[PDB]
RNA sequence: UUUUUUUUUUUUUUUUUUUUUUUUUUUUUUUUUUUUUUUUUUUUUUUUUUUUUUUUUUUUUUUUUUUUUUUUUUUUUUUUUUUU
């Protein structure tokens, strides 16, 4: 989902586990914005 | 200055009780009976040079004021009278 070039890789292995693959797909976009610990204090970043 | 008061008068031996009387061995149980190897998976397949900009153009002396003018001696009071 993140790297466009990544996806031409061949990953048709026997331990794909699509359920965890789907969760990763949802993690990139549908999970959340993902704001990590901010050294700079952005108090108005809720709308950001 | 001083003027009062300021000894003593009771009670204060003793009378009970104070040995002992129960109980105080023992009576169960107390081996063991399962299970206890193993059977998957486990190489790799993307991307990964570069393409902009990047000298300078202003201003930048000075113009005022800046001596002084008053006042500045003194004028009271200031022993004692009781009691103890």
Resolution in A: 3.5
Token readout for A12 is 């048709």
Q: How far is the CA of A16 from the C1' of B41 (A)?
A: 12
Nucleotide nearest to A12 (CA to C1'): B45
Token readout for A21 is 């693959």
Count CB neighbours of A19 within 10 A: 7
Nucleotides on chain B that have an atom closer than 7 A to a protein CB are: 41-42, 44-47
DSSP state of A44: T
Q: Which of residues 1-48 of A touch strand B (CB under 7 A)?
A: 3, 5-6, 8-15
Which technique?
Answer: cryo-EM
Distance (Å, whole) CA A2 – CA A28 = 7
Distance (Å, whole) CA A25 – CA A38 = 25
CB of A48 closer than 8 Å to CB of A42: yes
Cα distance between the two ends of chain A: 23
């Amino acid at each position: 989902t993140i790297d466009r070039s990544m996806g031409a890789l061949n990953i048709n292995r026997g331990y794909l586990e699509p359920m965890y693959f789907r969760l990763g797909q949802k993690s990139a976009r549908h999970h959340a914005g993902g704001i990590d610990q901010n050294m700079a204090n952005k108090l108005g970043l809720n709308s950001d």
